[PDB]
Design an enzyme around this catalytic site. Structure first.
Site, PDB file in Angstrom:
ATOM      1  N   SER B 140      -2.050  -2.914   8.610  1.00 61.15           N
ATOM      2  CA  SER B 140      -0.981  -3.554   7.860  1.00 61.15           C
ATOM      3  C   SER B 140      -1.527  -4.155   6.571  1.00 61.15           C
ATOM      4  O   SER B 140      -2.725  -4.425   6.441  1.00 61.15           O
ATOM      5  CB  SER B 140      -0.305  -4.645   8.698  1.00 61.15           C
ATOM      6  OG  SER B 140      -1.211  -5.691   9.004  1.00 61.15           O
ATOM      7  N   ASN B 206       8.193  -1.791   6.214  1.00 63.02           N
ATOM      8  CA  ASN B 206       8.908  -2.290   7.386  1.00 63.02           C
ATOM      9  C   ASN B 206      10.392  -2.482   7.096  1.00 63.02           C
ATOM     10  O   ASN B 206      11.225  -2.353   8.000  1.00 63.02           O
ATOM     11  CB  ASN B 206       8.285  -3.601   7.868  1.00 63.02           C
ATOM     12  CG  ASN B 206       7.332  -3.404   9.039  1.00 63.02           C
ATOM     13  OD1 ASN B 206       7.100  -2.280   9.487  1.00 63.02           O
ATOM     14  ND2 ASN B 206       6.775  -4.501   9.538  1.00 63.02           N
ATOM     15  N   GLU B 254      -7.205  18.980   2.660  1.00 63.28           N
ATOM     16  CA  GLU B 254      -6.008  19.616   2.122  1.00 63.28           C
ATOM     17  C   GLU B 254      -4.950  18.591   1.720  1.00 63.28           C
ATOM     18  O   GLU B 254      -4.127  18.867   0.840  1.00 63.28           O
ATOM     19  CB  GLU B 254      -5.449  20.606   3.145  1.00 63.28           C
ATOM     20  CG  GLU B 254      -4.775  21.826   2.537  1.00 63.28           C
ATOM     21  CD  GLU B 254      -4.770  23.020   3.479  1.00 63.28           C
ATOM     22  OE1 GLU B 254      -5.591  23.036   4.423  1.00 63.28           O
ATOM     23  OE2 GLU B 254      -3.946  23.941   3.272  1.00 63.28           O
TER      24      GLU B 254
END
Ligand SMILES: Nc1nc2c(ncn2[C@@H]2O[C@H](COP(=O)(O)OP(=O)(O)OP(=O)(O)O)[C@@H](O)[C@H]2O)c(=O)[nH]1
Ligand SMILES: Nc1ncnc2c1ncn2[C@@H]1O[C@H](COP(=O)(O)OP(=O)(O)CP(=O)(O)O)[C@@H](O)[C@H]1O
Ligand SMILES: Nc1nc2c(ncn2[C@@H]2O[C@H](COP(=O)(O)OP(=O)(O)O)[C@@H](O)[C@H]2O)c(=O)[nH]1
Ligand SMILES: [Ca+2]
Ligand SMILES: [Ca+2]
Ligand SMILES: [Ca+2]
Ligand SMILES: [Mg+2]
Ligand SMILES: [Mg+2]
Ligand SMILES: [Mg+2]
Lengths: 54, 438, 352, 425
Positions: B140, B206, B254
């Protein structure tokens, strides 16, 4: 609207579509930063105890 | 086959990691005890799922994951949860007291005393890898551990694994599911010291997960379990290519190649559809064109912003389920004639498409309904800069008064690291404007 | 109790709206930097749209459509009409225009001369006007050399479009004019036309043999009140209102303002706004937008209506500030934030 | 295992502290003998935050009772739950403090402080991980004020990186024992500015007015005032004693409630406050309207005179969490002129399913308001009314203090007032 690089397998397939063409710090330096912040903590706490001792 | 090691840091990373590995097991047919009946190679094999799961002689399939939290409450859930048998003790690392939402505390005070431990436990998983691709780091922005310790771990991973790639799944702070006032500080401190150490970062706001849960799932007050079960669906879609047979995004490299032409601008916008409430008796199954069209609706983006007012640098469509290339190109054609999709003149106007025939797996008893086809669009838009602007503005409001700054200085951080981090975000917003605006 | 902020002190329009809002006793004004607000009367330039709709439990509404500048910029509008299939390059109500960047900086210089040489050879009227959005700075000329050289002396993008050589003249006076129509678009993207328009007339007789003295060619209210000597002679403030102008069309031309002019105006407004709806609509956006527009039209001697420009921050005629401003609180603000007729607008139904 | 060590000092400190353990002991199912007898696991989830576990599944509070006279603590030992406190944790003298800050801080108190710190150290060494300390005390007397603050200074010297929290009862001439209370309070308030992370200001005047006007108590008593303090203390600590992620851990609370080190004096508030129409159900709007109302605030300060730096609300009981958010976001969006706009989202809300005894639901208010300066202004004025004449100073100079130390405490609080004033504009 071109399709290119079509790849197919048993679990799916993947392709590409083109609509239009176009037009570090060393380990030593990290320990120094860490220890520098640890020193300022030790200094700040030393001034607190010196304040309390007075 | 090349291995990927997942690292979960802080409460958000650990709980989100829980939802992902629960979903990964249901997808690959791994039972909570680690057993996988379909795996006919006992105690070995270089299959696609072996990128995320190691094997033991006993046939147990063990996640290549490490859990790190500066407090034991969150990780203790894993030790006694349904999938307690997946991991072994070394994989879970817990401290005694957390970072108190203080970046400086997680990065310096506490981080310095446990940093080398995470590295040692990681080295142990690396020693089981015959060709490690890189790391997926879940954390977070707002937490003290998630922000503070993560940036320290990234600095060391770049040192101990120079050539390896590092991707992030980062939780952008949202007042509706947060009680911390200082999350803007932490978010900006961790983005400044992590920017040059991350090759691709998937930000999840969020605020967006919260609204999708209330609007589509009819959850009045979504919980973390609700938010994580949905976030792991998006994460599953992004990591699926590494775990299944395919030709698109087969290695972590990638992702930078297909999504990040400019290194600092490595924050793709994610868009997922459909999200259908399982409480609905039965739902009209959406088509390929309808779900694809939904990818350009703000309502199902992982970060709320307006891509109509930005420039795309890349775009991947990841379909799962009943989808053939013919339907995809048909919807794309229509979407171009109706949607506003402006690319940067130095990038082609195209779409890489990946199709995995296995439809999205739904956790039994979860909130999402089983659908016949789903899609996740990864598009690198300058519009995502709206998220940096909001956050940097909140930072300025508090920092102008030096509010809460004494907490960070007291843990050994210098005040100048605030403005150093802020001037870097000022430069990040300028890079987005130069690339997107005229 | 609703809350709103004011971030454009220079807006006479929304100054009145804020005055009416406070008079309702149900709207409370907040500091310009207070994020907990319902309605933002935002600034003109660099309005922070990206910070709207991120306040838990607050439906936020702003008075500008993000992206509507494509319509309210001289060069942007030209690019929008030539490149939008809904408007096409063959748009019959917009003067033949071209985008010309000064040589000190794509560009349509060669494309402009091509059509210019064509008119010069065909004995046709070849009078063009050059202007830009960075002016009060306009030049009317029939020679391509003067038009291009004037732009190079400046440093901002300019637009050269055909000058309407046969404009409709009011009598008595033999004088030019334009028509200002206020159009309000709400969050649902309904297009409302204010039943009250104004003619900004020139108090000087139109002279087709002297584009140097631009007092009889430019009907701007500031130019007439500064460089025109007959200001206010025929009408108060060189402003004729629909009632008078309508009676004139009847007595003189034996027609009405609705049939000869208003149908074309309403068609142009619809065409322009519907064209950009997919780009600026706030239907599925985390905030809501409305905006007031000021369309400016020209009318030739054949009673054909031509679009001149669209204003994003238009002012109002003094006599119509009260009626319109209240009309803004009714359909734009109170429609999303209701309080505890015979509309003054004309709904332009369309397919969303 | 984030343990907290509790300390209560003096008459006021030990009487309020007693009722506190009486209240939360009930909420956790602990009976007067320390035996658990609840019916919910949520009671024992974070039980170790305030209770040690002894043999035979016994729970013993982690509390140290301190006083310079035996009287008050003798009553606690004979009180309702007196038997639940560790016998060794009673540390007391015989001389008394004579309501003299100097006696508690320099002379009498100094003779007893070391033995108290021996017990703290004993309780700390048993803590798997010490969150920090919380002290209950008044500032107008001698022991809780003078020696109380002497204990904080020393506890901070031995535990420099632990959170120090206090519930500090502030004196008022309307509820006064002696005229020197402003002297003792002005001396303590400077200690607290230096050595506490969080201090809950509890004005005895607000408590009295709440008992007279709201609770309709003709003749209030200290006992009545302490019922309010008990409930408020139970409320603000709910974040700690039950499963929650908001305000849990004293340092996280301090990190989100204290924008500046010295401005860490909070205004608490509780709702409901009903006079015996006491069975009526209380709606979420009512809880919120009252909890934010000044007549429910226990600092004796009008919030509409200053601005909120931060606010923390705790709702307890089975209610609409959706409706909680709506009403909270309604108070803010209806009075945003009283919240500083340079701290985004400075109002946080937490819900708890277990309500206080005998209430379907309640709300506790925790505000870091600049209005608190009105409280320090009162004390400062009452202080200078006497000190300008040197009235009653002989009690203090006779214990070794000098007038200079008073002039400094004076200036130290007038500075604290000017600090609150600059952040209100
Ligand atoms: N989506 C989601 N967000 C979470 C979750 N847990 C915490 N958060 C968010 O993370 C932010 C708080 O950071 P935490 O992850 O709890 O902090 P931390 O990393 O554990 O570090 P500490 O400060 O030491 O506790 C808030 O914005 C929360 O909304 C979760 O399980 N899912
Ligand atoms: N192609 C054209 N033919 C005839 N007249 C023209 C013209 N272009 C501009 N004008 C004259 O110029 C005036 C409007 O100029 P323009 O609108 O481009 O500048 P401006 O935007 O500063 C004034 P406003 O925004 O208030 O309408 C009108 O009165 C009109 O008579
Ligand atoms: N709220 C409350 N205040 C008290 C109580 N007892 C004393 N006080 C207040 O505390 C101050 C006296 O301090 P006290 O605790 O008696 O002094 P100490 O025993 O030497 O610490 C006075 O202002 C009293 O009003 C009590 O039980 N409750
Ligand atoms: Ca195998
Ligand atoms: Ca690297
Ligand atoms: Ca003695
Ligand atoms: Mg945590
Ligand atoms: Mg203009
Ligand atoms: Mg007493």
């Amino acid at each position: 609207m071109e399709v290119i690089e079509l790849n197919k397998c048993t679990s799916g397939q993947s392709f590409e579509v083109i609509l239009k063409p176009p037009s570090d710090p060393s380990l030593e330096e990290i320990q120094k930063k860490l220890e520098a912040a640890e020193e300022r903590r030790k200094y700040q706490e030393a001034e607190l105890l010196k304040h309390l001792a007075e | 086959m090349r291995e990927c090691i997942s690292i979960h840091v802080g409460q958000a990373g650990v709980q989100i990691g829980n939802a992902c590995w629960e979903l990964y097991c249901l997808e690959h047919g791994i039972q909570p005890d680690g057993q996988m009946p379909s795996d006919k190679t006992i105690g070995g094999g270089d299959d696609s799922f072996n990128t995320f799961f190691s094997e033991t002689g006993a046939g147990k399939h063990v996640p290549r994951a490490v859990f790190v939290d500066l407090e034991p409450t969150v990780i203790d859930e894993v030790r006694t949860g349904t999938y307690r048998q997946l991991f072994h003790p070394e994989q879970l690392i817990t401290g005694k007291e957390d970072a108190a939402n203080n970046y400086a505390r997680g990065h310096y005070t506490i981080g310095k005393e446990i940093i080398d431990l995470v590295l040692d436990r990681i080295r142990k998983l690396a020693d089981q890898c015959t060709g490690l691709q890189g790391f997926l780091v879940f954390h977070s922005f707002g937490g003290g551990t998630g922000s503070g310790f993560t940036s320290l771990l990234m600095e060391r991973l770049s040192v101990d694994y120079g050539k390896k790639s590092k991707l992030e799944f980062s939780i952008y702070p949202a007042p509706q599911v947060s009680t911390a006032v200082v999350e803007p500080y932490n978010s900006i401190l961790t983005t400044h010291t992590t920017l040059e150490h991350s090759d691709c970062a998937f930000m999840v706001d969020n605020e967006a997960i919260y609204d999708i849960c209330r609007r589509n799932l009819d959850i009045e007050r979504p919980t973390y379990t609700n938010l994580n079960r949905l976030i792991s669906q998006i994460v599953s879609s992004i990591t699926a290519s590494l775990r299944f047979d395919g030709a698109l995004n087969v290695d972590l490299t990638e992702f930078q190649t297909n999504l990040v032409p400019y290194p600092r601008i490595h924050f793709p916008l994610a868009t997922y559809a459909p999200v259908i409430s399982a409480e609905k008796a039965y739902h009209e199954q959406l088509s390929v064109a309808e779900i694809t069209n939904a990818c350009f609706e703000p309502a199902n983006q992982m970060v709320k912003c307006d891509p109509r007012h930005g420039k795309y640098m890349a775009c991947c469509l990841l379909y799962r389920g009943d989808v053939v290339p013919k339907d995809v190109n048909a919807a794309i054609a229509t979407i171009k004639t109706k949607r506003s999709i402006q690319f940067v003149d130095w990038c082609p106007t195209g779409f890489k498409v990946g199709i995995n025939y296995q439809p999205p797996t739904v956790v039994p008893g979860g909130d999402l309904a089983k659908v016949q086809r789903a899609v996740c669009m990864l598009s690198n838009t300058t519009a995502i800069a709206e998220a940096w602007a909001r956050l940097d503005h909140k930072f300025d409001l508090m920092y102008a008064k030096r509010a809460f700054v004494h907490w960070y200085v007291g843990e050994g951080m210098e005040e100048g690291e605030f403005s150093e981090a802020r001037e870097d975000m000022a430069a990040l917003e300028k890079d987005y404007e130069e690339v997107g605006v005229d | 109790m609703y809350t709103f902020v004011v971030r454009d002190e220079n807006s006479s329009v929304y100054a009145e709206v804020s005055r009416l809002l406070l008079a309702t006793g149900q709207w409370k004004r907040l500091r310009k930097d207070n994020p907990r607000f319902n309605l933002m009367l935002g600034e003109r330039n660099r309005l922070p749209f990206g910070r709207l709709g991120h306040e838990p439990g607050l439906v936020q509404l702003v008075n500008y459509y993000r992206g509507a500048d494509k319509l309210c910029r001289k060069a942007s509008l030209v690019k929008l009409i030539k490149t939008s299939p809904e408007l096409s390059e063959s748009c019959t109500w917009f003067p033949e225009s071209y985008v010309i960047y000064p040589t000190n900086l794509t560009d349509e210089r060669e494309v402009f001369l091509a059509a210019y040489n064509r008119r010069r050879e065909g004995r046709e009227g070849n009078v063009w006007i050059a202007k830009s959005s960075a002016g009060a700075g306009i030049l009317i000329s029939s020679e391509a050399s003067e038009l291009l050289d004037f732009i190079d002396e400046q440093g901002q993008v300019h637009v050269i479009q055909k000058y309407l050589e046969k404009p409709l003249l009011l009598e008595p006076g033999h004088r030019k004019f334009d028509i200002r129509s206020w159009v309000l678009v709400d969050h649902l993207y309904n297009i409302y036309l204010y039943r009250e328009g104004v003619l900004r007339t020139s108090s000087e007789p139109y002279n087709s043999a002297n584009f140097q003295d631009k007092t009889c060619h430019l009907t701007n209210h500031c130019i007439q009140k500064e460089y025109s000597k007959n200001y206010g002679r025929y009408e108060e403030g060189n402003e004729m209102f629909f009632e008078e102008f309508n009676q004139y069309l009847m007595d003189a031309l034996n027609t009405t303002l609705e049939n000869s002019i208003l149908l074309q105006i309403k068609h142009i407004i619809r065409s322009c706004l519907m064209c950009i709806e997919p780009a600026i609509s706030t239907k599925h956006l985390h905030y809501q937008s409305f905006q007031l527009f000021g369309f400016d039209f020209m009318v030739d001697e054949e009673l054909k209506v031509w679009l001149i420009e669209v204003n994003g921050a238009p002012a109002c005629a003094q006599k119509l500030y009260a009626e319109l401003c209240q009309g803004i609180v009714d359909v734009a603000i109170s429609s999303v934030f209701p309080l505890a007729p015979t509309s003054i607008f004309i709904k332009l139904h369309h397919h969303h | 295992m984030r343990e907290i060590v509790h300390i209560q000092a003096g008459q006021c400190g030990n009487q309020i502290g007693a009722k506190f353990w009486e209240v939360i002991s009930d909420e956790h199912g602990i009976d007067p003998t320390g035996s658990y007898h609840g019916d919910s696991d949520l009671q024992l989830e974070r039980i170790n935050v305030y209770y040690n576990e002894a043999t035979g599944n016994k729970y013993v509070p982690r509390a140290i009772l301190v006083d310079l006279e035996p009287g008050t603590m003798d009553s606690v030992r004979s009180g309702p739950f007196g038997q639940i406190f560790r016998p060794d944790n009673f540390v007391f003298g015989q001389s008394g403090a004579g309501n003299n800050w100097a006696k508690g801080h320099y002379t009498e108190g100094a003779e007893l402080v070391d033995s108290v710190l021996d017990v703290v150290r004993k309780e700390s060494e048993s803590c798997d991980c010490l969150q920090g300390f919380q002290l209950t005390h008044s500032l107008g007397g001698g022991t809780g004020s003078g020696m109380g603050t002497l204990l904080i200074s020393k506890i901070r010297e031995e535990y420099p990186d632990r959170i120090m929290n206090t519930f500090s009862v502030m004196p008022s001439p309307k509820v006064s024992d002696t005229v020197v209370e402003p002297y003792n309070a002005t001396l303590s308030v400077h200690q607290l500015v230096e050595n506490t992370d969080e201090t809950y200001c509890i004005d005895n005047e607000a408590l009295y007015d709440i008992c007279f006007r709201t609770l309709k108590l003709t003749t209030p008593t200290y006992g009545d005032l302490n019922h309010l303090v008990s409930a408020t203390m139970s409320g603000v600590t709910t974040c700690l004693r039950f499963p929650g992620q908001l305000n849990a851990d004293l340092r996280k609370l301090a990190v989100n409630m204290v924008p500046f080190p010295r401005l860490h004096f909070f205004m608490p508030g509780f709702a409901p406050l009903t006079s015996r129409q006491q069975y009526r159900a209380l709606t979420v709007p009512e809880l919120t309207q009252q909890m934010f109302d000044s007549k429910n605030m226990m600092a004796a300060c009008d919030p509409r005179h200053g601005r909120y730096l931060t606010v923390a609300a705790i709702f307890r009981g089975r209610m609409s969490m959706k409706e909680v958010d709506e009403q909270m976001l309604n108070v803010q969006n209806k009075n945003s002129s009283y919240f500083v706009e340079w701290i985004p989202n400075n109002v946080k809300t937490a819900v708890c399913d277990i309500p206080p005894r005998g209430l379907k639901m309640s709300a506790t208010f925790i505000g870091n308001s600049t209005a608190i300066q009105e409280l320090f202004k009162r004390i400062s004025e009452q202080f200078t009314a006497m000190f300008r004449r040197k009235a009653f100073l002989h009690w203090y100079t006779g214990e070794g203090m000098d007038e200079m130390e008073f002039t400094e405490a004076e200036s130290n609080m007038n500075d604290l007032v000017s600090e609150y004033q600059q952040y209100q504009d």
